[PDB]
Amino acid sequence: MSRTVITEVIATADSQGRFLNSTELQAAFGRFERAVPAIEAARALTKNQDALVKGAVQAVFKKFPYVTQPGEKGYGDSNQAKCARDIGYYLRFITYSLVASGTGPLDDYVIAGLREVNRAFNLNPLWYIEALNYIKGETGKLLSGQSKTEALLYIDHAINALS
């Protein structure tokens, strides 16, 4: 029941109990011409997995040096391993949102209930915000054209959600 241009138009038509007029078809055509840059951006972002996730982890460590040493969340091998896992999750859902060409996957799979989990596990949103900032900086170099704009659009949506 995710959110997508196709889903938006279907839901608006259904709620009003009518067919899809010319406006919904305009929107769907726009999405279908979206989907070539979106999918190739998702492909470029998927092919470049390990560099992105490792760089984001090390950005979390460098920008937040006090997390590194004992007595904090960042100490303990499993902690940074599972940090890498978390950044992998975030990158994966960015790719899902590029493929869907909507914020449906991000919202449903990360953003919904994000704050409660962050609170009840004592995780600072700032770590993830600046990690996404690093990933944004890298996609400023892996991608070009309107693909860069759309990948940055979804990363900005995720950052705004974290903030």
């Binding site: 029941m1 259904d14 709620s15 009003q16 109990g17």
Partner: protein
């Protein structure tokens, strides 16, 4: 007639505008107390006289009076305090909106909204919604509108309202030997399938 609800559909819609004289008001009160409290018996002690006075003066519309009744102690003591949250959501839908819940998303959203903002916000989400104002508006007493096809409804909504209805005589007491348990716990999250543990 093969459905139980022959008489409910035939039941007239009731409206209460500002210059209502006497018996329009008296009929409106009986219709409100019969529908909102789920055909449960409401003793003369529990009847809120001050809300009725406000309605008679016209300070609050019929919708505002419905909202106050939903926030009253009778509504709580019957539907909220004695039932799980699923049953509370179903009763809220059936009474305040006249329709059964359409999917599990409604239960999730309303349970989160209650847990985060309280019973008053939970109830206000129903009355202040655009759906209530579309179907009923300020001056129309709510009625069981799920028996006809409602624009945008799910295929299962009619069946769920049939499960909730239980005849013109039957009511949503909480005085049952069961204790007002929920009816649609498995129908909402698993609509079509049936399972045996």
């Amino acid at each position: 007639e093969r459905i139980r609800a022959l008489g409910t559909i035939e039941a007239p819609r009731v409206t209460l505008r500002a210059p209502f004289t006497d018996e329009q008001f008296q009929g409106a009160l009986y219709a409100i107390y019969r529908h909102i409290f789920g055909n449960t018996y409401v003793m003369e002690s529990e009847r809120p006289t001050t809300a009725e006075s406000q309605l008679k003066d016209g300070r609050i519309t019929v919708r505002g009076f419905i909202k106050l009744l939903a926030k009253s102690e009778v509504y709580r003591s019957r539907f909220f305090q004695k039932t799980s949250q699923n049953r509370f959501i179903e009763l809220n839908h059936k009474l305040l909106l006249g329709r059964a819940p359409y999917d599990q998303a409604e239960i999730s959203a309303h349970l989160d909204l209650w847990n985060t903002q309280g019973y008053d916000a939970e109830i206000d989400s129903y009355v202040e919604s655009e759906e209530y104002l579309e179907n009923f508006g300020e001056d129309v007493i709510p009625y069981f509108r799920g028996f006809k096809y409602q624009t945008g409804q799910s295929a299962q909504g009619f069946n769920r309202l049939l499960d909730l209805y239980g005849g013109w005589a039957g009511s949503d007491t909480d005085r049952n030997q069961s204790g007002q348990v929920a009816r649609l716990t498995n129908s909402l999250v698993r609509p079509g399938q049936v399972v045996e543990p």
